[PDB]
């Protein structure tokens, strides 16, 4: 898996590949690894498909109950709930999750939660097997306060390389745009991104 979230001027964008593998067999080639835990709080899932789905379903439950009582939760609050589950059950879970959300006060925010269950707030984050191949590329190319079109290109070019070199990553590039405007789903097909 290759997943990343990038903050920019208008908010945050989440990107992911669409491939699920058992060994070298591709079980699903059109996986949706971008999952909603709240209206404008989304996450990227890497590691165990079973573990990440179970965690995301529980977090969605917690934030729905939070919203009923105390109104819209912060992106930090969502990351804290993910951390709590991942840290306290670290012995039984294989889940690398990137939490990305849009507040109107805090704008775009990205939190990464590796295997340990530690929380790291970053301008952008990359995770999954394919991320190893694009550390060099992403570090050199990322700028703060990019435009929407710049951030979409940055994610498209980044995951394009991750997919090219990593056998475990492939299929379509799904993206989810989180701004004041709302929620926009984007898809990019091999015939486009392969020849970048």
């Amino acid at each position: 898996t290759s997943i990343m979230a990038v903050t920019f001027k208008d908010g945050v964008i989440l990107g992911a590949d669409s491939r699920t593998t058992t060994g070298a067999y591709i079980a699903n080639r059109v996986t949706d690894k971008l999952t909603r835990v709240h209206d404008k709080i989304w996450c990227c899932r890497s590691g165990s498909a079973a573990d990440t789905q179970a965690i995301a379903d529980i977090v969605q439950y917690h934030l729905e109950l939070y919203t009923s009582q105390y109104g819209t939760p912060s992106t930090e609050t969502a990351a804290s709930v993910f951390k709590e589950l991942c840290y306290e059950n670290k012995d039984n879970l294989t889940a690398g999750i990137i939490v990305a959300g849009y507040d109107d006060k805090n704008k775009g925010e990205v939190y990464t939660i590796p295997l340990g269950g530690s929380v790291h707030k970053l301008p952008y984050a990359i995770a999954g097997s394919g991320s190893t191949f694009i550390y060099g590329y992403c570090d050199k190319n990322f700028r703060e306060n990019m435009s929407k079109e710049e951030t979409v290109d940055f994610i498209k070019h980044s995951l394009s390389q991750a997919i090219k070199w990593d056998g475990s990553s492939g299929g379509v590039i799904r993206m989810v745009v989180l701004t004041a405007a709302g929620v926009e789903r984007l898809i990019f097909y091999p015939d486009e991104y392969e020849q970048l």
């Binding site: 491939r19 899932r45 590691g47 165990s48």
Partner: peptide, 4 residues
């Protein structure tokens, strides 16, 4: 044992 599906991974992502």
């Amino acid at each position: 044992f599906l991974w992502x």
